[PDB]
Amino acid sequence: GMTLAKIELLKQLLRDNEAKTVLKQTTVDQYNIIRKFNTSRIEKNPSLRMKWAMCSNFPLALTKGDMANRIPLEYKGIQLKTNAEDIGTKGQMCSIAAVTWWNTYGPIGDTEGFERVYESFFLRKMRLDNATWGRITFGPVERVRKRVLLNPLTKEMPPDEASNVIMEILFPKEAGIPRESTWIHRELIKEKREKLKGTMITPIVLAYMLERELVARRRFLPVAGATSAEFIEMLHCLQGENWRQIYHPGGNKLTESRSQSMIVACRKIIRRSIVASNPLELAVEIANKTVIDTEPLKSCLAAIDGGDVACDIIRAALGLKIRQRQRFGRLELKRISGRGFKNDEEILIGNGTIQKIGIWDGEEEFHVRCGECRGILKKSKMKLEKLLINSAKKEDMRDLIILCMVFSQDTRMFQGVRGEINFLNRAGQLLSPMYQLQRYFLNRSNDLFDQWGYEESPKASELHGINESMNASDYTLKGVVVTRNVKVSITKNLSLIKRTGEVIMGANDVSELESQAQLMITYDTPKMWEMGTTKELVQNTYQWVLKNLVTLKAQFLLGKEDMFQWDAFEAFESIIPQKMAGQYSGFARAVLKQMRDQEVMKTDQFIKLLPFCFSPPKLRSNGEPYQFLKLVLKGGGENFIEVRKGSPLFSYNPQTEVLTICGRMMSLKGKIEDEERNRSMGNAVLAGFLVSGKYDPDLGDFKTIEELEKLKPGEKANILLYQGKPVKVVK
Amino acid sequence: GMNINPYFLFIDVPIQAAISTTFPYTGVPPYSHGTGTGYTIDTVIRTHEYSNKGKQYISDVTGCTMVDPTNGPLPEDNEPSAYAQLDCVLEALDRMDEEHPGLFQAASQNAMETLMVTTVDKLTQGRQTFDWTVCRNQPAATALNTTITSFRLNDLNGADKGGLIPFCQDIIDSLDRPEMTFFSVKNIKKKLPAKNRKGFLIKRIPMKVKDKITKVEYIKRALSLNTMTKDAERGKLKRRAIATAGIQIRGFVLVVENLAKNICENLEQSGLPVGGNEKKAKLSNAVAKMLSNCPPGGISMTVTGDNTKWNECLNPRIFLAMTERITRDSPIWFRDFCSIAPVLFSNKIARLGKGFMITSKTKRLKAQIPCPDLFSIPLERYNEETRAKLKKLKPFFNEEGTASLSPGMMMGMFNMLSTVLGVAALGIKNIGNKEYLWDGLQSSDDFALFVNAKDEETCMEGINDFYRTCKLLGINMSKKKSYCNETGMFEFTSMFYRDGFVSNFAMELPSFGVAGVNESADMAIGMTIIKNNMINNGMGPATAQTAIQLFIADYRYTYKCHRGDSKVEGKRMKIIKELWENTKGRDGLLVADGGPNIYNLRNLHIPEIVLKYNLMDPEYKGRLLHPQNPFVGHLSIEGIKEADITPVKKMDYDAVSGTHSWRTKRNRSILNTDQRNMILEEQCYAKCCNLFEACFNSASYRKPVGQHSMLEAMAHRLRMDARLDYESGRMSKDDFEKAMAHLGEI
Amino acid sequence: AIERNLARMSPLVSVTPKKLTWEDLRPIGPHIYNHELPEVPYNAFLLMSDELGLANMTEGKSKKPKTLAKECLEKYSTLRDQTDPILIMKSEKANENFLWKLWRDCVNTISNEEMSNELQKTNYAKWATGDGLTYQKIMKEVAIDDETMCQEEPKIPNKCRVAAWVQTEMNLLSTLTSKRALDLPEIGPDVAPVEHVGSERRKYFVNEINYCKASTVMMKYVLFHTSLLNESNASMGKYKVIPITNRVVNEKGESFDMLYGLAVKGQSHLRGDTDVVTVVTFEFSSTDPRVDSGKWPKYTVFRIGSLFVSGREKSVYLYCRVNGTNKIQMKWGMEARRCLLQSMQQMEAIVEQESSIQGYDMTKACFKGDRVNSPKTFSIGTQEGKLVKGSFGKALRVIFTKCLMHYVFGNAQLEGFSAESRRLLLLIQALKDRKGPWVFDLEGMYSGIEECISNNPWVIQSAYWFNEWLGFEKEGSKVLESVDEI
RNA sequence: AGUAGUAACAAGAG
RNA sequence: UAUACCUCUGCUUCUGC
RNA sequence: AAUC
């Protein structure tokens, strides 16, 4: 036992008066102040100082111990260390040769336990060695900035919880007051104490290695397709702004992680296939050859008893049963009867703020579940009607009631959101309203039960009631009861119909949140880009237009409406908001035909609008099409094309004859008409409108689209093309 | 002939695309030489030049010359105005409170609830701090400990309670103490016996002596800011002065900065404290909104903006008035707590560097004229540049050798709260219901205003209205440096937007060099900086694979550790060549031990020790990863994971702790100097703390808590350790009775 | 209250904005074209274009820095044993005898059989290193009393005009050779497909630079500054002779140990980082210093033999100079290989961007030009007031040269210039993009740019190169884009 | 001398 | 002065938010 | 199908 030596060293220490005064005057708080006391200033230029110091004889300091003494003073003429002591360490200063001498001829220590101590790192090597790689592919990639886990953890905990667990593993006597966490991770502590038993390595090191494999490292990174930590660690080799790399990590993968991916895979198959005709036939084509990391979407949907609306529609579309389940984080549901419809309304909450939430309308019946506890839920628009739950643990019963209360979107629930905790991220991006309401009321539940209200318990033979404390009681929660008793076909347009005639799932019901997937979202067929994002699709289309411009510009002056529709443009239309798709396609087809029929042709404008002409056009009551300044696309305020100017996604430099498409430079030189040199752009800016002369001050100010559309054919007007270029145009 | 021009690339590639080539970061940064007295005095003159038309008065507390520009006459010129009008600042805040409701009182709560939990040790992480006891910039950990021990002599034990709040109460009360006593160490010669022919030896034992100063002298020392020059600051021709404040003010700045930080997080038009990929997103999303928000058939212009004399114009009395309005709902003690730091800065006194070295080229002699002796010599002796400066310093100069800098914010320190005042300018949006609309972004001196309007002639009238607003806040826009254009591309804090924030590899480029921690850490850091730049700084696989070669190149020369097979001569290389010939598993050797570089794009995230572990020889890994080896010795939770990179942000890495994770010698210059006395003072604490850690093994990981005595804790710990070891059987009757006898004496 | 003050405030206070137009952009630096000023002198630490390496073919493996410089001189003994000083050029404040005696003292010391490379503290070496030239510290009370002691006026950088040698340095350093200098070590094997693309990209990117002049100078600078720092810490009190070494490999694959001169490091008791250690250089050269006299006022040049460059003979010279470095600048020498990355990244961005557009690896296309696509071309420079189209490989190296010149002439003048010239570069890019740029105080913006141009060569030449490029971008944009949609 | 460039180093201290 | 052709020192009187 |  060390005990005697510690006390007899304390006797040595207390003999010195200056040391004795320190121990008596310093508090246990103040330890942290006196530990950091030294002469050492902070090194401002460490790269310099190290490069300098390495050229000196004896730059390294050493620890005063028996092992330090086992290093000799010289070896084969080379001085390893000097008798001169270091100020801080009180040990013989040495050269970098001593390090090499130790490693070459020193004592051979105990390496038993090392692999288990530094486990966390060896699994990163395990995830590279066992892994396999796929194809490199060059082409544009949108990369979105989002907070993600940098390294995969053994068991995630808060900073205090992980620390308290660590304390129990390494320093049990000094742990102090036990918490709930003491009990919760008892298996992990028992495992880690048995694993880290035989090792000789210092506690402070061991506690650092636990902290890495318990405490979470979450920071913002640019990502695209893969969000999972086992991918995030490899991110640098997965994707660059202009390339893609397929990667498959080793070991094992999580079941939940496979669903989060699986949803977005379906969600995009549906989001693509809607605009192209025979939506089932395109969705089947893709879905038969989609891949999640290694597993195909067919096998994932078969094995996983989860998914959403989109997953069910594809599950049907391919074949086999459809699990109508909704996972609200902890809660896991299943639909008995009723069919809801989402609606966005401005809902005032308890603290005094109004935030947009997608409210569910109509009456419904669900089969709830929360760990061990079970039940059956009934609700109407913003009201919980019934909750017939079974008896289980207090925490499982309490949280299931909180999950069901939020879910129901009750007006009583929204009034008790007091304590300013809103849903808007630090980086200017809105969090999901409903999920943030769950996390608030799970911890702060006193408002929820108080603002709900109570009533009489059920007086049946099998039915009873429970109060706020989760015990059998007379005054139960208003609409809560504790009882003792525990094929389809698919359309062309992707709606699931019952044998009778009613439609259980609709294509219009799938959620429009095109979020980041968890695992590698691969498409084994060609033309993968068709399931991408706005800037990925926008570019790849315009790249394909310029690729075939020799054919497409010729065939636009021979066949009238043969090449207005093309296999590439179907995908382009899917990122146009379909409430406007026809209106843009009316304008596009009208302005392009104005350059065909008349002599005033513009190749830059042709290439810009040629992708907009797939959709069947939708004109006004007059006959004339809809006129536009910008053609707005799906998601992000920056995403649009401009008619009368250059846009963030599409602009032209006519000096160099070079086109900028989402950043990428594209040479249009040697692919232009010579008569475009001084040809005005007003003759391809409004449909059925051409330039007479230049701005006439008698005509007045520059007239707007609404004003221009409401002019008689043969009326002159003032149009500003791009800033500082006035033009005088007639209908 | 043919004249090659590098600027001719800008025909083929636009400026923003190849902006990396406009940054000369392979080159050497500018450093200062000699004193920074003239640099400081120039700041002192300039600061008072912008306020001299305000209210000049004499402080009855200190006896100093004070100037006050706040609520002063408005400027009739484009020179830097410090004359900020309180009402306009309050109205700007009121608007911000309307646009962001319930924020001020919530943030005031957040910071107040933090304050209670914040310990005294929090002051130890302030780098070099001015120690008022010895008048030197010392380490924050020491500068605190000197201040705690000196307070104890004047009956001030607030630090003993453990909370910051009583220590801050002791600081405001220490001004009231008439004579402030403190320690100063002096040497006594003592005979100690020896085998020294004459059987003894003289040893200069240090001893601490009690030393007093007056109330006013202590007030001035408490209000002192020590000034240097700014070394290694990029992209500037002439050098500038900086400052370091004392331990007293440090406590009160933390809370006022935390308060403003809480506000700056929630504000939509700020790049602080948000950084890295978070700020890259926040600005990118906030651009898209403020772009597409503009009227159709109108104009949206982005003013690429920047302020001038940012620190010199902003008065402390504005910052005082800011806190009061932010804490309006919070209690009277916290309102008074927050009001101190701006009250100190309002009455601050600036120390004047080293002095002025005077010479005679004929005689070949030199001599530093120190700050107090600046006027102990005819002004004709100084050069024309310095002669003008000293004449202008006269009314503000203090006879002790300082200058009272009542206006301005030397150093700055208040970043967040000064950024909030910027955001408050951006929050106005319009004046007189005219046909323009502005909103922007902010990071202290750097702003980026957008203006949406009908035509461009209107836009410029709105930017004038923005300019004339910011004058009333004390925020002076740089007419020279700032410039405007149509929205689409701009610059902000060296981040270049051109329909998207472009990659600028030259900014990070210096960080690719060898770090200067140790062989094990620098390897891990080196491969980490590669990995990271590939992701978010746009390094392709070829350049990344080159950087792997270029790091190892510099590593092998810096640490003198070339491949064992290579015949490059060296002291270490001689043993490295023997290691190569001895060891069988030579691919398992680390580069530091002249091993081969196994690194590549895919495995940059893994530590070299972990990669090669399987291919090492048992004897090699046994020595390399020996548990009781002397090289590492004693670690700390901050030391293993984290390391500095250049405020200086401390990044983290991963590497195994083995023989190459060593430490270097202390700077031995301290041996020659009179500060020898601190060397023993350290080793006295180190002896106590290392013994404390033997009793409490969790003291390394967890910060121990306790207002009780440090000895008391150790005694009780050792008491049970004995008793339980006896009863268990680990200790005998012989040893237990010895142990119980010793603990009785203590 | 804001509006209340805004009303009563004086109209004199305003931004006073003006729309920027191409004619408002006057040429930067009037003085640099003025012929009354002296031409900017060559003031680099070592030689670059003018250097001459004494090639000793070796085994390839490393040896002592004395032993290689010895055997390098053994091969070219004619120059080694040339004792007669045939002086050509002199630096105003130089000592012909001391300098030559120093060179002879070096040559013999490298030639000798002893292990040490130490040079004796002679009467000449003490002049050439500056022994005892530091001033004496005295008591403040004495200096206060002594009426002769005064604060001296500060030394300011002089104003130089444009010099052609910088242009020619750029022209020459950019150009290819048959020799490779770089010491690029091994890496791990390529398993992933991105690593194979990265490897095949390096075979074009790295070996384009490696085979140029600028690559050899860069490597020479580094390897000198690596040993120069090493001697400076270890051998503080000792005056030591260090050779200017580089190992070079040709197209055949044969290691030629080079020697571009010899140098002598002074006494190096370097406390602060900025403390100077004076280093005396002696450098071989084919260039006649009487060609460009204004290039070499800092140098003192002898003539020491002759060498046949191929058939016709070239006279060999010895460029001597008292120079100096410091701990910071020596370190930055060791981190000067990073000049590769800053230029290689920039052009890998083009390869990556062009690979996205075409959908395959557009490396081999950009340099050589494959079946589908022609080679990528860049505006490289001028030919009697006209444009010139250089290839990818050339455009890569012109950027790489600039990154080396950012080091070689890296200082307060370059940093302050580059930053302020950027502001004007961005304003030009607005006029190029037709984004209607406005400015508030252009004269004062110019003032910040123009004050940084004094006596730094790369600053002075880049002020000219700016004004040349400006002239081309002014006539391109103001003609074509002025009248189009009218 | 030279390095440097608004002021230093070209050794300091006992 | 003397020891001192010795001895000690190379970011440790300045380098912040 | 998001939080920390």
Numbering used by the authors:
A (entry chain C): 0 to 485, 496 to 740
B (entry chain B): 0 to 645, 650 to 749
C (entry chain A): 238 to 723
Task: Reproduce passages from the article.
Influenza polymerase replicates, via a complementary RNA intermediate (cRNA), and transcribes the eight viral RNA (vRNA) genome segments. One promising target is the heterotrimeric viral RNA-dependent RNA polymerase (with subunits PA, PB1 and PB2), due to its central role in viral replication which occurs in the infected cell nucleus. The polymerase binds to the highly conserved, near complementary, 5΄ and 3΄ ends of the genomic RNA (thus pseudo-circularizing it) and this constitutes the promoter where transcription and replication initiates. The polymerase performs transcription by a unique process known as cap-snatching.
In previous structures of influenza B polymerase with bound promoter the 3΄ extremity (nt 1–6) was not observed in the internal active site cavity but was either not visible, due to disorder (FluB1 crystal form) or bound on the polymerase surface (FluB2 crystal form). We attempted to determine a crystal structure of the cap-dependent transcription initiation state by co-crystallizing influenza B polymerase with the vRNA promoter (5΄ nt 1- 14, 3΄ nt 1- 18) and a capped 13-mer primer ending in AGC-3΄, which could in principle make three base-pairs with the terminal 3΄-UCG of the template. A trigonal crystal form, similar to form FluB1 but grown at lower pH, yielded a structure at 3.8 Å resolution, which, for the first time, clearly shows the 3΄ extremity in the active site. However the electron density for 3΄ nucleotides 1–6 is weaker than that for nucleotides 7–18 indicating partial occupancy. This could be due either to 3΄ RNA degradation or a mixture of conformations between the disordered surface configuration (previously observed in form FluB1) or entering the active site. Of the capped primer, only the first few nucleotides (m7GpppAAU) are visible in the electron density bound to the PB2 cap-binding and mid-domains but the expected extension of the primer to base-pair with the 3΄ extremity of the template in the active does not occur in this crystal form. Apart from this, the FluB polymerase structure is essentially identical to that previously described for form B1 (8), notably the base-paired configuration of the distal part of the promoter and the hook conformation of the 5΄ end. The structure shows that flexibility at nucleotide U6 allows the proximal 3΄ end to be either outside the polymerase (as in previous structures) or pass through the template entrance tunnel into the active site cavity. Remarkably, only small side-chain movements (e.g. PB2 Arg40, Lys43; PB1 Met227 and the Motif B loop 409–410) allow the 3΄ end to thread through the narrow template entry tunnel. Although the detailed interactions of the template with the entry tunnel cannot be elucidated with certainty at the current resolution, the electron density suggests that highly conserved residues from the anti-parallel β-strands at the base of the fingertips loop and from the N-terminus of PB2 are involved.
